[PDB]
Design a protein around this ligand. Structure first.
Ligand SMILES: NC(=O)c1ncn([C@@H]2O[C@H](COP(=O)(O)O)[C@@H](O)[C@H]2O)c1N
Ligand SMILES: NC(=O)c1ncn([C@@H]2O[C@H](COP(=O)(O)O)[C@@H](O)[C@H]2O)c1N
Ligand SMILES: NC(=O)c1ncn([C@@H]2O[C@H](COP(=O)(O)O)[C@@H](O)[C@H]2O)c1N
Ligand SMILES: NC(=O)c1ncn([C@@H]2O[C@H](COP(=O)(O)O)[C@@H](O)[C@H]2O)c1N
Lengths: 206, 202, 202, 202
């Protein structure tokens, strides 16, 4: 609880007065040598130059954290981002797409049984989910307020006043803004924002 | 106050168990029936027809497979029990079944709830129009969930030392006495020598 | 020669369709019933009781959801149609449902078969004690599958220009005339103006 | 003539096994590596970078979990093995993983194939843009499948009495000698005293 301010990987999703969004932040202790990279309609969490090797030491440190498929934004702390986005692309409602992926992928097999978390949002709805050694949960994001979840400590949706009017601001906020400023070991962050004219990506370093 | 269908699962000083209770307004003409290693919620004599009016009112609410007890408010009881029987951990068996079956397509989008318990662990789950949830039942305390209102696990001091008592308790005992429209209930208890079934009417 | 429950799906010069036929030995006291956008296989008057003896004899064999027709030999018809209704491509909808429901737990491990078809594509699938299979129906030709013997898609020249004809054909027409113990059949046809239902008795 | 990634599974007079072979044109700079109870297909020194160009070229092709051997052409090897480890029959473990993972999103929609074998049974499966298939491997004979051309189980007289021989055979032996672009292979054999791993280069 209280003295444990290290949430590990964090993601937020929802809508505010300026538009819809998904934010993601990498918090790490054992692998801080990483950054976010923007590529065609996706943001990848990858090793910074010199540490390419790391992906061979740990299979959970490199993955697309954000995938944009049509009007849908997908965010997750691992390779399941692709699993989910692909299902949405091929036609599958958000809840099931997240549910099926997490159920199959399951929690990560590391020394902490690190959970797999994810969220997806489109024009009319948004869902957030997590899978751990103790269970599986996927739930509708209340339209009334953005929420966030992490792999450690905050392993269930938590309401948050996420103020941001662009992907750059969104990424900066989950990295240093509001309640997120208190969560330790920030490394890198990324976000996708949609003010109505489409999904835009952005990244932010410390 | 009207929770609709209710189920509880967990362990107490006397043993392990699953309890189930039918609460209904539109279909109160039902009872529980014990058959080989399962308890079915069925129409009382004269209303056989009902199953043809509504496809969610008749189903096995309890299935015993080996050392595992399965309880649910619908046909997914069989979907889950079958997977356990064929080898699948409780969490996934409940998760896969609920994900596929989904909430019931009635005027209320009535959720599908379920729980399963064996010698070492127990899980409880629910699927609704707003999501899916399957979670480990804390060994420290029994829990219960319903299709309406109490749509998330809630701790309960479930005192019972037999299937008969367990069934009677979810039907009229403790906090359950306040939940309206009781119709019928059933339960499975295991004091260590195996699963036993029982039913209780109002 | 006794294939048990049979279903066909595909397109011909007159339109798209799904046909279903009940072949039975132990439960021949059944018929098809048309209700809102679905066809149910149910007991004929006097045998309502049967559904309580065997849980696999009564179920919707056909469900129409928007531009999609779904057909299957069991309750998974609803599981699949619901997923399509909520947005899920045909292949996955059939795949997920069969994977979860699994083969029927009777003395024969009777397989669960299904097919779904819409404006652009169609899929057919089956799940048995030996595996799971879901595949794209070739646009070049209609196919059919059964719970016994013909447990894999088989091409068929399915001539029919209406649901009535389609139902009659899978019941007595072509190659289907040779399959024993026909009881009842139903079908859904779409000539471009929408899905229409029909049933045919012996 | 070019089958791409290939895997075989089954039993012969000497024991049980799973073999895997990487055939490639665009990425031939790879080898197999043995680590604790698993074999990984990885880039040879100097090409570490490749994994960042294509996400489907590096993955564990073989995982041993207890008495079970798992083989696949991609990261789903871990998805399947993990489910078996946590308790899930082989058919479902392969089915669920393939259904979720789906075919690879490359310029060829490269299928995901897999197989798993333990003391009593074995299953093989594949998922492609046209469908999903998981089926019981006949005990009477070993089978193999590939991502291209041979996209359905094919019987094979797989002679081998050790992991080394098994790996060598799928790489250059029998019918496999005719399949083009061999790069590296690996295998797991169980003569009754446990699973042993081995790799073979050209
Ligand atoms: N998703 C990630 O970026 C990630 N980074 C690390 N991990 C897992 O969590 C473990 C501990 O991470 P850390 O010590 O940075 O909190 C790592 O060893 C790995 O197994 C992840 N899931
Ligand atoms: N589980 C049950 O026994 C059950 N009984 C009814 N129902 C569904 O809930 C609806 C409302 O039931 P009630 O009026 O008992 O609250 C019914 O129309 C039906 O769709 C059930 N799922
Ligand atoms: N789908 C059906 O209509 C059906 N009817 C019967 N059955 C199952 O197959 C068994 C054998 O049926 P029959 O004797 O008609 O070949 C029945 O006892 C039951 O378990 C079915 N699946
Ligand atoms: N599993 C593998 O080893 C593998 N190697 C390559 N591939 C995918 O198949 C594509 C074509 O492979 P190739 O060019 O070797 O026939 C590659 O570009 C990649 O997308 C694989 N799945």
């Amino acid at each position: 609880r209280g003295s444990h301010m290290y949430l590990g990987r964090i993601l937020a999703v929802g809508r505010n007065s300026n538009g819809s969004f998904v934010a993601y932040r990498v918090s790490s202790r054992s692998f801080p040598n990483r950054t976010t990279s923007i590529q065609e309609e996706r943001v990848a969490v990858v090793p910074v130059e010199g540490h390419e090797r790391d992906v061979f030491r740990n299979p959970y440190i490199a993955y697309n954290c954000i995938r944009i498929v049509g009007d849908t934004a997908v965010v997750s702390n691992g390779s399941h981002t692709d699993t989910i986005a692909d299902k949405v692309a091929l036609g599958m409602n958000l809840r099931d797409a997240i549910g099926l992926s997490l159920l199959a992928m399951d929690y990560e097999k590391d020394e902490l049984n690190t959970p797999r978390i994810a969220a997806a949002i489109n024009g009319s709805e948004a869902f957030i989910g997590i899978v751990t050694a103790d269970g599986l949960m996927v739930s509708r994001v209340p339209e009334e307020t953005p929420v966030y979840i992490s792999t450690y400590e905050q392993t269930e949706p938590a309401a948050t006043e996420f103020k941001a009017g662009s992907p750059e601001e969104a990424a900066e906020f989950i990295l240093k803004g509001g309640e997120f400023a208190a969560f330790t070991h920030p490394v890198t962050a990324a976000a996708a924002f949609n003010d109505g004219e489409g999904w835009n990506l952005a990244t932010r370093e410390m």
